[PDB]
Amino acid sequence: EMSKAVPFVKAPANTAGYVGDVGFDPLGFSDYFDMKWLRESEIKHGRASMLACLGFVVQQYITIPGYTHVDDSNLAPQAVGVSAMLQIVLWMGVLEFWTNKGNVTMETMFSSPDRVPGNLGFDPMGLSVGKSQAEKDEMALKEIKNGRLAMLAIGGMIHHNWVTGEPL
Amino acid sequence: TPLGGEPVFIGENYWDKLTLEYGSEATGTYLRAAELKHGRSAMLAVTGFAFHKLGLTLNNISPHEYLSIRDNIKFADLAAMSPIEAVKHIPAEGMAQIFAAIAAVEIYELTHRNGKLAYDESVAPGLQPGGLTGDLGWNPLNIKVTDRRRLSELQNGRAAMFAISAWVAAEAIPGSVPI
Amino acid sequence: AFEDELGAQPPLGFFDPLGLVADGDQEKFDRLRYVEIKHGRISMLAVVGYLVQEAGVRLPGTIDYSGKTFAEIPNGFAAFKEIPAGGLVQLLFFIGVLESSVMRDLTGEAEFVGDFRNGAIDFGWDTFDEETQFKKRAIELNQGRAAQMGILALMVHEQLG
Amino acid sequence: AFEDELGAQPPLGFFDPLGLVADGDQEKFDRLRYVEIKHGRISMLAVVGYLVQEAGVRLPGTIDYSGKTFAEIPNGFAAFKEIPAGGLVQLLFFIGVLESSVMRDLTGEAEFVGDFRNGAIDFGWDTFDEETQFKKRAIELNQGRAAQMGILALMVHEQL
Numbered sequence: 001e002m003s004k005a006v007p008f009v010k011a012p013a014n015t016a017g018y019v020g021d022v023g024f025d026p027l028g029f030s031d032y033f034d035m036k037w038l039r040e041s042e043i044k045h046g047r048a049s050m051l052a053c054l055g056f057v058v059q060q061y062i063t064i065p066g067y068t069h070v071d072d073s074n075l076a077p078q079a080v081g082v083s084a085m086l087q088i089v090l091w092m093g094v095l096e097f098w099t100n101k102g103n104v105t106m107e108t109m110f111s112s113p114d115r116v117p118g119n120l121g122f123d124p125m126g127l128s129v130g131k132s133q134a135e136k137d138e139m140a141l142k143e144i145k146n147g148r149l150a151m152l153a154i155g156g157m158i159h160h161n162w163v164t165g166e167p168l
Numbered sequence: 169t170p171l172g173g174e175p176v177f178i179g180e181n182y183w184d185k186l187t188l189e190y191g192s193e194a195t196g197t198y199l200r201a202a203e204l205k206h207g208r209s210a211m212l213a214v215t216g217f218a219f220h221k222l223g224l225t226l227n228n229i230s231p232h233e234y235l236s237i238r239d240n241i242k243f244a245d246l247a248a249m250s251p252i253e254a255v256k257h258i259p260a261e262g263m264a265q266i267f268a269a270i271a272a273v274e275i276y277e278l279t280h281r282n283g284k285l286a287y288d289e290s291v292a293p294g295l296q297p298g299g300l301t302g303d304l305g306w307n308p309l310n311i312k313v314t315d316r317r318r319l320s321e322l323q324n325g326r327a328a329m330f331a332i333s334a335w336v337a338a339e340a341i342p343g344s345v346p347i
Numbered sequence: 348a349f350e351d352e353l354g355a356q357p358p359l360g361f362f363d364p365l366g367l368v369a370d371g372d373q374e375k376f377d378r379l380r381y382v383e384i385k386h387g388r389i390s391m392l393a394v395v396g397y398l399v400q401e402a403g404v405r406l407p408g409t410i411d412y413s414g415k416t417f418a419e420i421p422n423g424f425a426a427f428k429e430i431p432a433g434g435l436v437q438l439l440f441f442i443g444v445l446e447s448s449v450m451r452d453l454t455g456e457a458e459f460v461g462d463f464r465n466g467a468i469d470f471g472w473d474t475f476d477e478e479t480q481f482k483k484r485a486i487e488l489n490q491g492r493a494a495q496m497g498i499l500a501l502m503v504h505e506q507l508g
Numbered sequence: 509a510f511e512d513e514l515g516a517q518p519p520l521g522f523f524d525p526l527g528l529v530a531d532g533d534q535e536k537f538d539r540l541r542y543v544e545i546k547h548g549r550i551s552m553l554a555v556v557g558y559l560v561q562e563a564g565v566r567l568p569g570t571i572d573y574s575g576k577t578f579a580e581i582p583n584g585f586a587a588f589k590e591i592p593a594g595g596l597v598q599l600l601f602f603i604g605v606l607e608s609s610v611m612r613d614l615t616g617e618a619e620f621v622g623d624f625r626n627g628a629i630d631f632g633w634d635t636f637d638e639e640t641q642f643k644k645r646a647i648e649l650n651q652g653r654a655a656q657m658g659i660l661a662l663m664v665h666e667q668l
């Protein structure tokens with residue numbers, strides 16, 4: 001009846017069979033928008049953040065030969081140019097069209113009865129294959145939580161430098 | 169439940185910790201695949217190093233010794249500056265070319281599942297559980313594919329790896345045993 | 348109680364001068380093997396370190412980008428004087444990550460304590476009879492006992508001169 | 509009502525002048541006792557601190573790499589402000605890991621503290637005498653209860 005997370009507003013409907021469910025939706029976005037799109041968004045925002053949290057830290061100390069070491073990760077695009085930056089994002093596109101067999105909008109995605117949120121088919125090593133349901137639910141709670149930590153993280157790493165002018 | 173191990177003696181050890189508790193049967197395949205890749209790479213490297221040390225280069229074995237063909241990069245000069253300090257003298261063009269072939273092979277090992285490339289998929293065939301078994305199917309004039317051949321190949325692989333590692337170490341710094 | 352266990356061997360055998368397993372005051376039937384094995388494993392890599400790390404075989408190159416070579420770094424507690432203090436933390440830290448992430452019973456199939464890997468010191472070892480375990484796990488345990496008296500020597504004799 | 513509990517020793521017995529466990533709740537006693545036992549010994553280590561410190565007993569050597577020695581350190585509240593800024597961080601850190609590690613032992617209010625063998629040292633709860641623990645835990649509480657009034661002396665007998 002009431003929310004588990006914040007126990008003085010009403011419990012959000014149509015968020016029941018999802019992994020990180022603690023009933024946290026005070027602004028009611030899940031009442032208005034499709035829940036499969038919102039989950040798929042939250043996982044993708046989290047995975048890009050987790051890669052950017054490693055990136056922001058490892059870029060200070062490791063630099064690949066041919067580039068210029070930049071003291072602050074934030075100043076890296078200027079030290080790589082625009083041609084290299086566009087190559088990254090245009091290939092990200094091509095990797096995204098192939099990803100969802102061409103269904104790339106909020107109307108075409110999740111039009112098949114298959115295609116559950118976050119299941120890319122990606123598993124080269126075999127992590128979580130042939131196991132039980134409780135274990136699968138547990139490992140999915142870890143990807144959400146670490147991704148949510150990394151989103152609020154990748155703010156702070158990027159923001160710290162905004163004010164100041166030196167690395168992490 | 170993996171393939172044959174050490175012939176003189178056997179020991180699996182660090183295998184059930186990831187193919188039962190950490191991972192599963194899909195990880196087993198992947199691991200073997202990686203091992204085979206590394207083995208083959210090491211073998212080729214070993215052969216190359218051996219050839220370089222011996223002396224059988226273009227100047228000794230053929231009529232052509234001018235690799236650069238514009239950058240004045242003869243084979244004699246590259247055969248007189250060891251094996252580790254020779255790979256850095258390779259022209260960028262050539263480097264690019266080499267990266268190309270390898271890239272193509274890797275992509276094939278990734279797209280072309282079985283007989284032909286797969287046009288529609290969420291991810292690449294080899295990026296899924298058990299995506300790359302280890303065998304690419306490249307068997308020109310295939311003599312045999314038995315249970316002995318595989319084991320022999322594997323053994324030659326690890327041996328080659330160790331050998332080349334040792335070789336590199338010795339060129340770089342005091343190793344341990346003789347060469 | 349534990350007179351027939353690993354480590355009791357001639358000439359002494361079971362020899363507890365303090366009365367340590369004489370009761371369970373703090374559950375002395377367990378963890379005292381684990382506390383005895385753990386110090387010695389440090390000491391065995393220390394003394395096979397420190398004697399080779401006295402003989403004069405060095406790594407090539409420099410400890411950093413600023414040109415400080417490894418050959419300029421002597422042996423002993425003097426070697427930590429020529430480690431800059433950023434190194435002293437990271438030398439502890441990713442070893443300290445090993446204490447909480449590999450230096451514990453991870454999978455739960457440990458026959459013993461110090462039993463973490465199961466398969467990689469299997470040195471043609473599966474053939475050998477269960478008795479060969481008790482031999483080279485006494486030989487593990489008693490190298491580690493005797494390498495502490497090696498390393499406690501080679502730490503105190505440096506400060507004594 | 510709330511008698512025969514831990515540490516109600518008689519020079520008084522039933523120390524409740526104003527109804528504080530009864531008008532607290534059903535259970536604040538389970539908080540309050542956990543709350544009291546921690547306050548008692550932080551006072552004890554304050555009393556055993558501030559006395560052994562005042563006798564001049566110091567650790568031989570320096571506290572940092574810049575040459576600040578322990579014998580250059582006077583006492584009172586003038587010694588926490590002297591140990592350096594980074595030196596205070598590593599104090600507070602593996603303290604702050606351990607109000608995390610001890611409050612969350614799969615039960616919060618049933619068992620008390622979360623005994624000192626949490627880290628680097630290991631505890632046995634099985635060796636567990638019924639009669640021996642009533643006196644020894646009620647010494648221990650009542651040592652700290654006097655130590656709190658004792659440390660409240662030496663914190664307040666500095667300012668006046």
Ligand code: CLA
Nearest residue numbers: 272273274275276279280282283284285286304305306307
């Ligand atoms: C780099 C090596 C390489 C190899 C060997 C091939 C080989 C092949 N391609 Mg691919 N391809 C490649 C790179 C490669 N391609 C690259 C870089 C691209 C662009 C990214 C493509 C784009 C592509 C497209 C769009 C198509 C193919 C097609 C095909 C197959 C022909 C169609 C068919 O019916 O055969 C099937 C083969 C058999 C029935 C015989 C099976 C026997 C096995 C052993 C294969 C032969 C051995 C193996 C190919 C050798 C590789 C080992 C390596 C070390 C040399 C053929 C197997 C067509 C296809 O397969 O789909 C219809 C096709 O439409 N290719």
Ligand code: CLA
Nearest residue numbers: 170172173174179180182183199200202203206326329330
């Ligand atoms: C990158 C190459 C590589 C890879 C992926 C593997 C992978 C594997 N090997 Mg293996 N092996 C290798 C190289 C490799 N090996 C070499 C060089 C040798 C010769 C010494 C051997 C000798 C060997 C034997 C004798 C057997 C295997 C077996 C196995 C399988 C089970 C063991 C396991 O879980 O992994 C092993 C652990 C890892 C791959 C972890 C990676 C190592 C870490 C990350 C870094 C280590 C760096 C190290 C310091 C390099 C110096 C060399 C070392 C000897 C000091 C597994 C598929 C067994 C098998 O087939 O099943 C029973 C088996 O019988 N291997």
Ligand SMILES: CCCCCCCCCCCCCCCC(=O)OC[C@H](COP(=O)(O)OC[C@@H](O)CO)OC(=O)CCCCCCCCCCCCCCC
Nearest residue numbers: 090091093094097098100101102103104107108287288289
């Ligand atoms: C350099 C990168 C180029 C490589 C192209 C990569 C191809 C992408 C993979 C195709 C999907 C195949 C999967 C199933 C195949 C499939 O059926 O899906 C086809 C896909 C739409 O599929 P669906 O029809 O299932 O999608 C839902 C539709 O029914 C709409 O309701 O459309 C495309 O393929 C677009 C391909 C990109 C076209 C790029 C051209 C660039 C035009 C941009 C113009 C810029 C204008 C600037 C402003 C003026």
Ligand SMILES: CC(=O)O[C@H]1CC(C)(C)C(=C=C/C(C)=C/C=C/C(C)=C/C=C/C=C(C)/C=C/C=C(\C)C(=O)C[C@@]23O[C@]2(C)C[C@@H](O)CC3(C)C)[C@](C)(O)C1
Nearest residue numbers: 182206209210212213214216217251255329466467468469
């Ligand atoms: C119990 C115990 O002890 O551990 C256990 C557990 C543990 C350790 C995990 C185990 C394992 C797995 C292991 C040991 C895995 C190790 C794998 C290993 C060691 C893999 C090396 C590859 C080398 C390559 C690819 C080199 C290529 C070299 C190439 C591609 C070259 O180009 C060579 C080159 O020269 C040419 C030809 C010409 C020159 O101009 C250029 C250079 C110089 C570059 C085991 C087996 O279970 C045993």
